[PDB]
């Protein structure tokens, strides 16, 4: 069921950080060169793959969704839903973290942090 989201294909296969941005309801990869820079107007999903203490050859997961101070409701809500989807894609193993701009957890801060002005346009059609 999560198999119908192309963005998850190949995710979480090695230790590291993978990042997607919500863009008009779609999950769009963020190129590695930009990891750590977040548009204040947008919402993101950050998958941290690491080796657990219990076995240095296995993989565990923290999944953070990051909500910019000016992100719109469609973007934050998509980021939440798709975080659950990615968690399910990885068998429920990821631990979820909600990160709000300026309130990021110690865990999130430890992955890197630059905040960029603006962001992509909302996916909502505004009803007048």
């Amino acid at each position: 069921a999560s198999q119908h989201e192309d963005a998850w294909k190949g995710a979480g296969k090695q230790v590291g950080v993978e990042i997607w941005r919500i863009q008009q309801f779609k999950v769009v990869p963020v190129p590695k060169k930009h990891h750590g820079s977040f548009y204040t107007g947008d919402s993101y999903i950050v998958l941290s793959t690491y080796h657990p203490k219990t076995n240095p050859d296995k993989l565990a997961y923290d999944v953070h969704f990051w909500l910019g101070a000016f992100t719109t409701q469609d973007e934050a809500g998509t980021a939440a839903y798709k975080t659950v989807e990615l968690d399910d894609y990885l068998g429920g193993l990821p631990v979820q973290y909600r990160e709000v701009q300026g309130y990021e957890s110690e865990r999130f801060l430890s992955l890197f942090l630059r905040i960029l002005d603006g962001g992509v346009e909302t996916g909502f059609h505004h009803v007048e």
């Binding site: 069921a1 409701q73 839903y81 009803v127």
Partner: protein, 362 residues
């Protein structure tokens, strides 16, 4: 192909199109027939309730008149949204802990009568949490029929901890009718119920300290408000302003032995695993029209603080748009291709029948 989102409330239909930021059709979930022994639906029935008796096909979140509910759905599709339902995958909503026949029959009518190509039934409180941009928290949803508490962890409702109370907006309207009648007025009929519902929405509030407010109301007229009835008479409302929603915290005001909404929230959190309770207390999300009373968030903050451990961090989130949070959460989810992948198709219904809703939804 655009999906429809229809949040059938006990009091109001909220319907519209996936990807819109608000429902384009919002109207009373009512059917009106001549008060003197044809039928009218929605705003038009409300417009001339002067010669109609009004009936709600949904009571306490449950469809109790399936013939009239079909009329409501037909009106939503053909007269309000003006769409052909056979062309639109449709997202519906439901309060938790309903009798299983309700969503079975919703599924049957949608496919057999309206011939929708696909549909899905989502729990209302869960849609509201996602609309708030959260996967963990506890939702208090209170509309016209049901108050429900749903704790949600990593995106999934925790059904063992859900609390439900068949006390919500319509019971508060009825109680205002009663206590206003005790002030010398007379509000009894179904049309007069709609007048008092408007008084409630415009003038009621939740007192931070009920006993103190009751004493303030007796000491002077400072809390009184005036209201113009449809016939021109102007009435005055006093402590009824806050006695009416006090019922949410003291259900014995209408003879109910149930816990109030602060206690049901606390009880719901306490049914959850200890290690997630701090995140639930810090993420109490309110949704629905009966959470719109001025003062309710502050009162909930105070009452939960008194129930919780003394150091517990408690936060009430009260989105200004929370009369539409369920709908908006649905509009977001129905805009995602992978969510629609999970919907029941007409073919699956043809082969499996109404039981299909339990396999694909709940």
């Amino acid at each position: 192909t655009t999906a429809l989102v229809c949040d059938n409330g006990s009091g109001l239909v909220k319907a519209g199109f996936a990807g819109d930021d608000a429902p384009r059709a919002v109207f009373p979930s009512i059917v009106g027939r001549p008060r003197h022994q044809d039928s009218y639906v929605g705003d038009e029935a409300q417009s001339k309730r002067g010669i109609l008796t009004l009936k709600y096909p949904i009571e306490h979140g449950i469809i109790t008149n399936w013939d009239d509910m079909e009329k409501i759905w037909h009106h939503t599709f053909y007269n309000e949204l003006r769409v052909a339902p056979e062309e639109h995958p449709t997202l519906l909503t439901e309060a938790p802990l309903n009798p299983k026949a309700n969503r079975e029959k919703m599924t049957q009518i949608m496919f057999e009568t309206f011939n929708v190509p696909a549909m899905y039934v989502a729990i209302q409180a869960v849609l509201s949490l996602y609309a708030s941009g959260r996967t963990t928290g506890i939702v208090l949803d209170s509309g016209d029929g049901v108050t429900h508490n749903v704790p949600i962890y990593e995106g999934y409702a925790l059904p063992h901890a859900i609390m439900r109370l068949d006390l919500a907006g319509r019971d508060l309207t009825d109680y205002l009718m009663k206590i206003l009648t005790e002030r010398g007025y007379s509000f009894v009929t179904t049309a007069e119920r709609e007048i008092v519902r408007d008084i409630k929405e415009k003038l009621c509030y939740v007192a931070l300290d009920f006993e103190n407010e009751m004493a303030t109301a007796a000491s002077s007229s400072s809390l009184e408000k005036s209201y113009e009835l449809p016939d021109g008479q102007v009435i005055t409302i006093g402590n009824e302003r806050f006695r009416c929603p006090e019922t949410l915290f003291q259900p014995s005001f209408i003879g109910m032995e149930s816990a109030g909404i602060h206690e049901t929230t606390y009880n719901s959190i306490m049914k959850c695993d200890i290690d997630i309770r701090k995140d639930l207390y810090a993420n109490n999300v309110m949704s629905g029209g009966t959470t719109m009373y001025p003062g309710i968030a502050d009162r909930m903050q105070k009452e939960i603080t008194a129930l919780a451990p003394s150091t517990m961090k408690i936060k009430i989130i009260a989105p200004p748009e929370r009369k539409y949070s369920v709908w908006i959460g649905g509009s977001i989810l129905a805009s995602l291709s992978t969510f629609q992948q999970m919907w029941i198709t007409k073919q699956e219904y043809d082969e499996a029948g109404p039981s299909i809703v339990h396999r694909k939804c709940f």
